[PDB]
Design a protein that fits this description.
part of a larger assembly; 6 chains; A: about 475 residues; alpha/beta; Leucine Aminopeptidase, subunit E, domain 1; Aminopeptidase; 9-stranded mixed beta sheet; 5-stranded mixed beta sheet; 15 helices; elongated; B: about 5 residues; little secondary structure; about 0% helix; binds zinc ion; aminopeptidase (chains A, D); protease (chains A, D)
């Protein structure tokens, strides 16, 4: 009927199968082991081989190379390596079944059902909705009955990420401020009725004196929205929450400090800060974690017009500070000035904001790990340890006064929204946000280098990666335990 | 996204 | 020790050539201690040493290359394995055929700041008369355009037999350092520390507040970081992940390409290129390009070449010796 | 022992195999047909499927989709479509055997042994020589004894192209003027002893008053070479020859009108005009075509130095005309001014020059067909018809006086080496060459858009394509018959 | 190769 | 020093 993804490790005397693979070989009376031998060189990790008609039920059987059985935490790479081996291997195996146009697959748990489910649900995702020319939708299920809640924990974690990838990948004319708030809203309520959504309009934002955010949204005719999500997971309702904040620019053209044409279409994903944190709240609520979490996301477009922000303008943040808006394409800073002052209202335990903030983070680490600026090494350590697990790596960046300085010397105002130099572009923008944060446990995750995948993360196809939504979910899980 |  | 580095760096490249640099360091090291030996190795030695990647960069100029080799014999036993330092010594980086823009290319006279920093710290270790053995290695050449310069696309062979496709002639530090880093394994080191004004991307990154250090040794990371607290001349870690190796390993003609396909993680890809030439377990690459200059940021330094991080390096050796 | 590439067409009642495939199925008693059915959806053209252990001798059997059996000349695409179906399909099949690390393969003739051999020898080529990390060298042979000289005609045509791809792909520090002349020289003598090579030095070029070519070579310390090849294939030695001319810049940095750093490494292939025409003479001689052919190629590098060409300089061509060298990166024009006057010395029947001349040809057609400028519609027609056959397409471009004009108005001189405008960049450069040509049968093939392959020509991997060497060989074959 |  |  269907397909079957099966694993095997690198040599012992004979490279060894997963116990599911060994079982299946016994079931077809040694025929898998035999056809593997006839097919030639052994399967190294991530690689694939397909075998036809070994069993009446699995006419296509894909054997995937899982590398070393005992691969664990790598000190150099800072991740569990086995989990990463398995994500890439069952992603590759699953896409081979899909190219065979087979609608269903049974996936080998590979000794870690959670990492097996993450490779298949992440590796098979595309965002197909607007092409009439689509791939067969395959349905991936666990090959077995034994480790079920781990496999479904993987399905949970990976679907939390794929929500983010879909929120990001959708063209900005469909994923506007209102549309984004409405999809997150429904996704949060289906996850738990211990939720409340507030899709706050322009009049509220005005009443909230969020003039820095309003200054950015004015150039467009698309209405701003301030999204506020609550997941009431603690037994006591009066437990202080963990707050998440995210940049929600649904399209960044730069405005009057207009962007170059080349590849500005990827700016439809400049709400990836709001996608990532909102997907993790949806997944925390699905996981029904015993914690209270608020989700905050300013959503607007940044367009040029006869009423847009002009370079040089001084706008007042909620907290009374004035910002000189020297460059209109440093709008995340602005939107986040106001949303971060608002987070202190909730009396948080932790404030975590995420944002596709600077191209300089991309030049920096950009691609291999998201940069996290934190005044809390406790919080740094928490995110970093969750990162080992998920494999969706995080790397620390300096939150030194030296950078504050380059943003504090300012002609008309209290803070300038851009530094005098090109140097340390992501550290200066981090210094701008700290100006709007008094909290002792604050992390700023600059997600701009991890916005996209090409080939680097094996189990993700080309397009918006939804990174780092799983490191964020893992952090909340561990924080709740 | 500014550039650099 | 730092002001030596600032003077080696600040001097116009027409005065601070390969020969001149080796000669000032040489005298500064001998005045510090007679437990020293200097070798200002000429082109013929470098040729004999099969350092074709370094030679490929020096050929476009008529200014002669020099491979500087410094020894400070500070241990009681002469057979103690040394700590080796390596440093980029481009006395002027014009980019060559992948020529640089005119604006402010005068600061490229300080592209030997990798060789200045590590050599000043050996001079200061010897002055401090630290009870350790240290070798100082610095390839010194200019990178000029000419009728015999390196051309984009050329494949050159490093000392270790690997081929490099030189896709961009302005990624020459990588090349000079490929050969000097293979040579460091000859000394049987305890530690290999190289420094270099390598990429403008390190400047966009941290660039200015701390020098970036890529190390396969968290022990070594920790040592440099703790010395940094003390000196105040801060150091910050950067990723030495296989992901970046990959972008430098996929290569059309050769084993390694001297530049990555993308702009992304510019200092991590260049770090990945150097690791290809390093088998040692205690290696740190310090990319010094964002800390090459001071304007106003470090209060006690006037405007010009900062000589960073020479004191964090001296402190590291002091503590390492105790 | 080995692998076997087998073809199949798209449906009839059951999609039908090539008679070799049908034979093999009978040989394994219907097992191929059976495993194909079990493996799912039919193979459309270019696509592949691999079947293990069907026969003791062919433990890997790759079935390749050949599309429609009766596909012929397409009026819209201007090629034989079947030949193109087969090149792509057995190239894909052969690279699947190579990924299995199998050193030998038997290839199905697919009803056209010549097109089957072209897909395998073109599709398996890489230029591996400088990496110590290489793919298994597979040896491709014909599956059968029946159509042998067609398969070897394919091996001939494709090896003629792969010579060009290797001459082009080699880093310019290894493929210098002297090196290039020396590899062509040996390749021409092994093809036939009815050959003569002249690797003419700088002193000869000086004696030949080729001041325009010499002006370009002076900026480099790498010595110029004027390569002169003769293949004496006619019964009468006094038959007027067909002459080929080719641009041989072994690296184009632009000189004083220096090029931007980005991707200037591809300029190692700016001797692709000399590679293409020289490979076709080597293949004409291997084919031992009954014609006389001279091969002419000026070989030098174009570097910046204290003695390079300066913008504004006036240099005298062999024919007495002065050229103002306004842009030093229009050096092909110059090298070719002198080599094209020299071609009239031989008293030719045809003069065909080829050159990676302008980036404007790439913006134009660039990629899909090489542009040919000819004052001879007879010659146009000949090249175009050969192009249908080889599938390596050619497209005509205007050799109108309007363009001559933009190159003839010139301040100091008779001709300016660049036009006042960006407009019709390849037609103005063609107009410059015509100034140095009095012959009635002249074609200029501007090869710059076909210098490289990425994915466009299925049976060529990524890198220098060696285009259009086979259309050129086909032209000579037909011209000789 | 000039550009355009 | 390359740029970026
Ligand atoms: Zn922006
Ligand atoms: Zn933005
Ligand atoms: Zn450089
Ligand atoms: Zn040119
Ligand atoms: Zn050219
Ligand atoms: Zn440099």
């Amino acid at each position: 009927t269907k397909g079957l993804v099966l694993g095997i490790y690198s040599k012992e005397d004979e490279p060894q199968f997963t116990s599911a693979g060994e079982n299946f070989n016994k079931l077809v009376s040694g025929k898998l082991r035999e056809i593997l031998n006839i097919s030639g060189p052994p399967l190294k990790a991530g690689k694939t081989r397909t075998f036809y008609g070994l069993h009446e039920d699995f006419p296509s059987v894909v054997v995937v190379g899982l590398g070393k059985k005992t691969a664990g935490i790598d000190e150099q790479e800072n991740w569990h390596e086995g989990k990463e081996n398995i994500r890439a291997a069952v992603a590759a195996g699953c896409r081979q079944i899909q190219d065979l146009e087979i609608p269903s697959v049974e996936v080998d748990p590979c000794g870690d059902a959670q990492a097996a489910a993450e490779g298949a649900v992440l590796g098979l995702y595309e965002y197909d909705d607007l092409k009439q020319k689509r791939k067969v939708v395959v349905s991936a299920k666990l090959h077995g009955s034994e480790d079920q809640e781990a496999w479904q924990r993987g399905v949970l974690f990976a679907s939390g990420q794929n929500l983010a990838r879909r929120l990001m990948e959708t063209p900005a004319n469909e994923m506007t401020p209102t549309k984004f708030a409405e999809i997150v809203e429904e996704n949060l309520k289906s996850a738990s009725i211990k939720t409340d959504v507030f899709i706050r309009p322009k009049s509220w934002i005005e009443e909230q004196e969020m003039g820095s955010f309003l200054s950015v949204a004015k150039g467009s005719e698309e209405p701003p929205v301030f999204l506020e999500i609550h997941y009431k997971g603690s037994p006591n309702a009066s437990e202080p929450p963990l707050v998440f904040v995210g940049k929600g620019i649904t399209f960044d053209s730069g405005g009057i400090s207009i962007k170059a044409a080349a590849n500005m279409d990827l700016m439809r994903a400049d709400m990836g800060g709001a996608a990532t944190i909102c997907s993790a709240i949806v997944s925390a609520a699905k996981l029904d974690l015993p914690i209270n979490i608020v989700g905050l996301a300013p959503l607007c477009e940044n367009m040029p017009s006869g009423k847009a922000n002009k370079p040089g303008d001084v706008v007042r943040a909620r907290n009374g500070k004035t910002i000189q808006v020297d460059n209109t394409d440093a709008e995340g800073r602005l939107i986040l000035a106001d949303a971060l002052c608002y987070a202190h209202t909730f009396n948080p335990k932790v404030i975590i904001n995420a944002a596709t903030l600077t191209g300089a983070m991309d030049i920096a680490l950009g691609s291999g790990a998201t940069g996290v600026f934190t005044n809390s090494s406790w919080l740094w350590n928490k995110l970093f340890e969750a990162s080992i697990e998920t494999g969706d790596r995080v790397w620390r960046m300096p939150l030194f006064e030296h950078y504050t300085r380059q943003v504090i010397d300012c002609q008309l105002a209290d803070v300038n929204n851009i530094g005098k130099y090109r140097s340390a572009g992501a550290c200066t923008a981090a210094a701008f946000l700290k100006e709007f944060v008094t909290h002792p446990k604050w992390a700023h995750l600059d997600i701009a280098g991890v916005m996209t995948n090409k080939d680097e993360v094996p189990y993700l196809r080309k397009g918006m990666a939804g990174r780092p939504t799983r490191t964020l979910i893992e952090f909340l899980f561990r924080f709740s335990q | 996204x500014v550039v650099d």
